Amino acid sequence: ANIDDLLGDLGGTARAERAKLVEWLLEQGITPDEIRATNPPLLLATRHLVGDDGTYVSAREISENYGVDLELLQRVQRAVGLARVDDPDAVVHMRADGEAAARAQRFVELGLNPDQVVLVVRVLAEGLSHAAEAMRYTALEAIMRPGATELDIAKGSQALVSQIVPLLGPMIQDMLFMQLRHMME
Amino acid sequence: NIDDLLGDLGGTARAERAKLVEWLLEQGITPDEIRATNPPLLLATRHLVGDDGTYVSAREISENYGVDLELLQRVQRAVGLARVDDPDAVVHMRADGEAAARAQRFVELGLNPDQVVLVVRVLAEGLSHAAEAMRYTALEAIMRPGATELDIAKGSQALVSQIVPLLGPMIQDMLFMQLRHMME
Ligand SMILES: CCCCCCCC/C=C/CCCCCCCC(=O)O
Ligand SMILES: CCCCCCCC/C=C\CCCCCCCC(=O)O
């Protein structure tokens, strides 16, 4: 099994546990290049559901592609605070993360202050990254059972995130407006 | 009939308020909602964020949207915005009850109720901070020297109407932005 070179240094009971996972990952459309560049491979057949497709871009690439100001965009990228960033040409931004930052420009175009917009992003990124860890453990509790293998987790993880994701979007959307309805007074 | 609605305000602030109240009454707002809401500045903006002025009880919500009352009441407490704790008090906005009823859907996938409620709490924490900063961001743009109370109202109705369609997707996109991050 030449896939013996995606297993690396893993031995014992864990090498068989990994081999079965790589078996299922490869047969999902996942390529050897992604598996090698991701330890643990676990979340590979799952990360596509939250918008991550392994495609990376640079701030300048985002700036030209989506027709946005580079300076303001990179301010918003510091505000979300996700990738070690400060070079317009570092291809280190997830394609979807890049498109998400390009929308901030639109709020500034509606007369809202670019200093304030960047601040709102900062507060949101702070609040959502705390809910993120509450979300991580909630799902992990739901998919970790007796003595499940790597594959068991990857299969359970893919199944659960698939059902959950269509709900999360309109959920948090409903949540934000609930706060907007009660901060109003 | 406006004279009652002006309250104790006099002089300059009264004539301003007078014009604002004549506007709000045309916009469908009842004298009750104006009395109960002081300042009444943003009553013409509330319907742009989901507030249709109609209220429901936890009983109405639980049966209609078909969700468990106990979980519903827990979720409403985690949001920490309406604290009347009794089943049949008609004190919840219709839009909020709809939003709180979404909790049940997550539980019925095998997710733990205690953690579902916890995540609700941690979200309402972040969004309340965020909404506060949003209000000050909005207020800055809608506001400039010597603008009447009516001026701020018509302008905030114009500005908020433009921002709303982008906010939903924005908060949605910002959620997945952080979710992708956990996974790597
Ligand atoms: C990348 C995210 C960019 C952040 C953009 C900032 C969002 C703009 C905020 C929304 C304003 C609408 C809220 C209405 C509050 C009304 C203020 C008032 O009380 O008079
Ligand atoms: C009003 C009720 C609110 C319901 C809160 C939703 C509960 C969130 C639970 C799980 C969704 C998060 C999905 C991502 C978790 C990480 C999984 C993983 O990558 O291993």
UniProtKB/Swiss-Prot annotation, chain A:
Residues 1-181 are annotated as: Regulatory domain. Homodimer. Belongs to the adenylyl cyclase class-4/guanylyl cyclase family. Catalyzes the formation of the second messenger cAMP. This is pH-sensitive adenylate cyclase MT1302. It comes from Mycobacterium tuberculosis (strain CDC 1551 / Oshkosh). The chain holds residues 11 to 195 of 397 of the full protein.
From Swiss-Prot, chain B:
It comes from the Bacteria. GO terms for molecular function: adenylate cyclase activity; ATP binding; lipid binding; metal ion binding. Belongs to the adenylyl cyclase class-4/guanylyl cyclase family. Residues 1-180 are annotated as: Regulatory domain. The chain holds residues 12 to 195 of 397 of the full protein. Catalyzes the formation of the second messenger cAMP. Homodimer. Disulfide bonds: none annotated. Keywords: ATP-binding, cAMP biosynthesis, Lipid-binding, Lyase, Magnesium, Manganese, Metal-binding, Nucleotide-binding. One of its GO terms (biological process) is cAMP biosynthetic process. It comes from Mycobacterium tuberculosis (strain CDC 1551 / Oshkosh). This is pH-sensitive adenylate cyclase MT1302.
